[model samples]
Target: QSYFPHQNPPAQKITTTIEDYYQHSIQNAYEGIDFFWGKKPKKGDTLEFWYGRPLQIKRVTFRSGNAEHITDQFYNTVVEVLPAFGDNNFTTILHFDEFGLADGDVEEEFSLVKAIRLRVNADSKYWVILSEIYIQTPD
Candidate 1:
């Protein structure tokens, strides 16, 4: 046996988990990601974006589908915000419509949020393609 140590690059951080995906990763949604197409947020499919710290959130922005392509559908989704601590339940922030990359204003902003979740409650006939999710803080 040869004594050799291997050096690998720094491991990538997982900020989001997508239950419904194939050829692409949630990472692709970041790093200046623009909607191209792929991956469906099907029925009961959950997509959670985990932030590193529990910070107070102010705004939320997301791209539901390809706006330029005009392939957008009226798919319903529940945007849930997880409180940083306690036995508190996730509060629904907003739902999806026609606007792409639109803002979902927090009507009653409060507490430190750990992560953001998108719960899909759509029919199989139509698919929900998400491009990016933007979490904002009041700094």
Candidate 2:
């Protein structure tokens, strides 16, 4: 599988809109399935992948909404990571304005990430459908 994505991250939290436990549960966040559907996506809804151990994040994979539901996308979102050595803050890696795309490979010099978070910054009726999200380190 992909090294960027860990199935079991010690401690993780995914709190978006109402999750359809019947189908799209919190497991869908990184399930790598087709996509996870967030019913009503509001601002501040975020998904966090926390690794309480080592943190050597150099790259991350983020695939937004799927092709089927092209419009089901968040207005504004941010790709950030919690620094292992910092003042209890996050480092911004990428930004999402008004463009819609699939699969984002962001590589750069990271100060070691303790937790990777995908957070929505805007409330929209468009909802949210994330296809895939992967966080990786140097191979």
Candidate 3:
């Protein structure tokens, strides 16, 4: 059997628009800092990442808003994962109507994957703040 540690690779391409503010930007989500992406993300907003090489991924975690500021963001959201194989098609790995608040951390495990595309819903009333995102492989 093969063994690999959980790793959070850098994103090769990200479609999500960064906020005008320098402190709050899409890059903050992976910066391991307190700052986050502060913007009203719509239905089609996405983040795409690569592993430099090919690595099998089994888990993914997302940290959005905390309990203190949950109400200020969209309570109902959807998170979908698209694995990039040979084809350009994508598969929906996870979907959550009520996400990104309350617990503030959402984690999901799945089959081996190479690359991933993350999508979130659009709620005009509230802003979507992503603090951190972690993608892991099996040990």
Candidate 4:
């Protein structure tokens, strides 16, 4: 499968922490930031998977962790899964607010089969931790 950014330019990693592994981390440097897969995926972009014919979407599972500290701005650390993967032409599938340390879960069995695109939008200065993602489907 391939992913591409819709509107935003290719996301760049702002590495602040200097270490081989397990460092204290950057002090609000906003380094080592990465997207879901380090690949830019925008709205209207289709993610083609080689599976059986005519599938139905059952549900999606999203998980997030606690928020970390930052320098310039207090990152919101939110994650939004959209029908499309870009900032435009998409609707939110799931949204999680971590600033309040509030965990969330949403289930939509509406069957958005044609809706095969997804976009994630985050507040500026905030980074979201996406732990696990499971897309359910039936034969």
Top-scoring candidate (lDDT): 2
Alpha carbon lDDT of each predicted model: 0.54, 0.60, 0.50, 0.30
Please provide, for model 1 over 20-138, each residue's C-alpha lDDT reduced to its tens digit, 9 standing for 90 to 100.
Answer: 34534445454434332344446776666565766676777666665443454326767777777745567777777656344566655544676666676764454445555556566
Can you write out model 2's per-residue Cα lDDT over 1-139, one digit (the tens) per residue?
1112244333444544445435555465575443566775677877677776656755576655566766766557787877776667777677654544323454544547677776777777775666656565555
Output the better candidate (2/3) by TM-score: 2
How much is 26 displaced in model 4, in angstroms? 22
* TM-scores, one per candidate: 0.67, 0.75, 0.67, 0.35
Full ranking by TM-score:
2, 1, 3, 4
Worst 10 residues of 4 by lDDT: 1-10
Off by over 4 Å in 1: 1-24, 72-74, 100-102, 108-111
Report RMSD for candidate 3.
6.9
Error of 4 at 112 (Å): 3.4
Error of 3 at 21 (Å): 3.8
Stretches > 4 Å off in candidate 2: 1-21, 97-111
Candidate 1 vs 2: which has more lDDT: 2
lDDT of 4 by residue, 1-139 (tens): 1111112211122222112122222211112232132222222222222212223455544333223322212123222333322333334444334332223333453343333322333333333233333445542
Ranked by lDDT, top first: 2, 1, 3, 4
Looking at model 3, the pairs that clash are: none
Overall local distance difference test of candidate 3: 0.50
